[PDB]
Structures are given as structure tokens and as C-alpha cells.
């Protein structure tokens, strides 16, 4: 027979089965960090399925590297890097052509700009539906540069709220900061930002990313903003995480 | 009992991991996170049975 047989000595049928390793697989899963800990490095959270039990595969290198991308293209694995893909806000630490082709095909036809536009207009419709009760004069769609959707180094204005009054806004606090202290100041125009990112395994913390982006862009020169008071909403498309750190006027946070 | 076989097994495990690394990318990495190989096949990973002292 043309195949070299590792089991030249035993027959499954006559001897039975001389070893079992299901326990090995289960202990392997446990030691890897649980099913969830295994899946955190995966792109699963970017697929936004609710749970992992009800799925199946279809019987792969390309699928294998794309599915394990958020833990492979991390800055720790490859250094001296962060060349950015075109028309996209994604960072590929290291030249990973297979991940690169997967990432272009997964973002074809100006898809990143479409997400930015859609998030903007949906939040605009939300604020139009909630204009009067929040004491909003109007909502202004800021002139957004076509490449602003994939402009990481700096940022510009996206959505503006005019009050027709002077809003009382609070200190810059995260979207979940139910306990927020008053800023002891007032403002009339309120800015909102839509920041998109592809969190890798090590830097998928949307809260820290949002806080850093808000505190850097507000104190930045290539980031012209109509008012010091506003919010910067960072949305991690990679793990479908979101957080906003900027100031909050009454009713704005909930 | 055979020590040379333990050393050989670890060397060959590293060789398999390194060939996977080279197939995945041309440049050789630093601290490739091992959960890529050892994750069970039904959970996406390759499913490498280990015979070495690899620490997670």
C-alpha cells in the first residue's frame, strides 16, 4: 500500500482502541482560556453572532488567517510597521498579503466611508426625533471630508447640535459613566464625532481608545472643532464595541 | 526515558510552527501567540497535540 502506516502493530477492530484523547481536547480548551477566551482572539465578535454553540463550518488557509487576524496582525507580533490600507482605517502591523486581500475584499466599494455615513445619519435622525425635548435648536451635518472616514491621525467635526439656549454640560466621561460630575460651565453648540477603528487583540479596548482619541483631538491643532464642548464616539468594528467619552448635557447621556 | 527523543520532539514542533509562520507571512515574527495552533479544529484553530513545555 502506497501509504506509510503509523499503526503497523495494532488493528482497531481486533485490539480495540488503546488510547483516548477527548479528555485531552477538553483540558486543552480549558487551559487555552475557556471557549470565550479562545474566541476573543478570533474575529467572532466582529461577526456579531449572539452565541457560539449553534454554528458549524462547511468543509481554508485564507479563512484561517482572516479568522485569526485580530491576534496575528497585532503590534506585538510584528514591529516597525503600521502601514495603513487604502480607503480604510485598518492597521496591518507587518505585510500580511493574505490578510490584506481578505481585508480589501471584506471592505470593497468604499465600505468604511459607508459605515461612517450611516452612523452619522442614523444618529442625526435620532437627534432630529429628539430635538425639542433636549432643547436643541437644530442639527447640522458638518462638511465631512471623503477621507475623514479613514483619517486616524487627526479628526474633524461630524455632527453639530445648536441649542437655541445655553446647555449645561458635564466633565468628559465615558458612555457608561453613570456617575458624572458637573463641568460648571455652559455652551450653545454641541459637537459629536464618529470614530471607527479595527481593534486588534491587544488594543480592542474601545473605552480607552475613545478616551485617548477625545483627549488628544480636542487638544490637537490639525483637529479644528467648533466648540471645546462635545462628544467623541469611538466604535470598534472589529469587536463591535462602542464608547463615548466627551461632555454630556442633560438627557444626552441616556 | 529517551532524552534525545524529547529534544527531537520539541525541535520538530518548533519546525512545524515555524513553517506555519512562514506560510502565513514572509517575515518571521516575535511572540506569535500560541493559541493559533493549539485551538481545537472545530473552534477554528489547527489542533496541534503538544509534547513540549510551552507556557501560555
Amino acid at each position: 500500500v502506497l501509504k506509510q502506516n503509523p499503526f503497523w502493530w495494532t488493528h482497531q477492530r481486533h485490539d480495540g482502541k488503546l488510547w483516548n484523547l477527548n479528555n485531552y481536547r477538553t483540558d486543552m480548551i480549558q487551559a487555552l482560556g475557556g471557549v470565550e477566551g479562545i474566541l476573543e482572539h478570533t474575529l467572532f465578535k466582529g461577526t456579531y453572532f449572539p452565541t457560539w454553540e449553534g454554528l458549524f463550518w462547511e468543509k481554508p488557509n485564507r479563512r484561517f488567517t482572516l479568522w485569526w487576524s485580530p491576534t496575528i496582525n497585532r503590534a506585538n507580533v510584528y514591529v516597525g510597521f503600521q502601514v495603513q490600507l487604502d480607503l480604510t482605517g485598518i492597521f496591518m502591523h507587518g505585510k500580511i498579503p493574505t490578510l490584506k486581500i481578505s481585508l480589501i475584499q471584506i471592505f470593497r466599494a468604499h465600505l468604511w466611508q459607508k459605515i461612517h455615513e450611516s452612523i452619522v445619519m442614523d444618529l442625526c435622525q435620532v437627534f432630529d426625533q429628539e430635538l425639542d425635548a433636549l432643547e436643541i435648536e437644530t442639527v447640522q451635518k458638518e462638511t465631512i471630508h471623503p477621507r475623514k472616514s479613514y483619517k486616524m491621525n487627526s479628526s474633524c467635526a461630524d455632527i453639530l447640535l445648536f441649542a437655541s439656549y445655553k446647555w449645561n454640560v458635564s466633565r468628559p466621561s465615558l458612555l457608561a459613566d453613570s456617575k458624572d460630575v458637573m463641568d460648571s460651565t455652559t455652551t450653545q453648540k454641541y459637537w459629536i464625532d464618529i470614530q471607527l477603528r479595527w481593534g486588534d487583540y491587544d488594543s480592542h479596548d474601545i473605552e480607552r481608545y475613545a478616551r485617548a482619541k477625545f483627549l488628544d483631538y480636542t487638544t490637537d491643532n490639525m483637529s479644528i472643532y467648533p466648540s471645546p464642548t462635545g462628544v467623541l464616539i469611538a466604535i470598534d468594528l472589529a469587536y463591535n464595541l462602542h464608547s463615548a467619552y466627551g461632555n454630556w448635557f442633560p438627557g444626552s447621556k441616556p | 526515558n529517551t532524552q534525545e527523543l524529547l529534544d527531537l520532539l520539541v525541535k520538530c514542533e518548533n519546525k512545524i510552527q515555524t513553517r506555519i509562520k512562514i506560510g502565513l507571512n514572509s517575515k518571521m515574527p516575535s511572540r506569535f501567540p500560541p493559541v493559533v495552533f493549539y485551538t481545537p479544529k472545530e473552534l477554528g484553530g489547527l489542533g496541534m497535540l503538544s509534547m513540549g513545555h510551552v507556557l501560555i
Partner: peptide
């Protein structure tokens, strides 16, 4: 913490060849 395997020679003092070896139950 490098990801390369380490030679098991000398790191097995605390284990036996069968420790954690389990036999499946009837199906």
C-alpha cells in the same frame, strides 16, 4: 514569554505517565 516549545527533559518531576489519563464511560 516566547512561544517556542521547551524540551520536556527536566520539567516532568511532578507528573507521572498516566496522571490525568481517563477512561470513557459506556455509550
Amino acid at each position: 514569554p516566547t512561544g517556542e516549545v521547551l524540551s520536556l527533559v527536566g520539567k516532568l518531576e511532578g507528573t507521572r505517565m498516566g496522571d490525568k489519563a481517563q477512561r470513557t464511560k459506556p455509550q
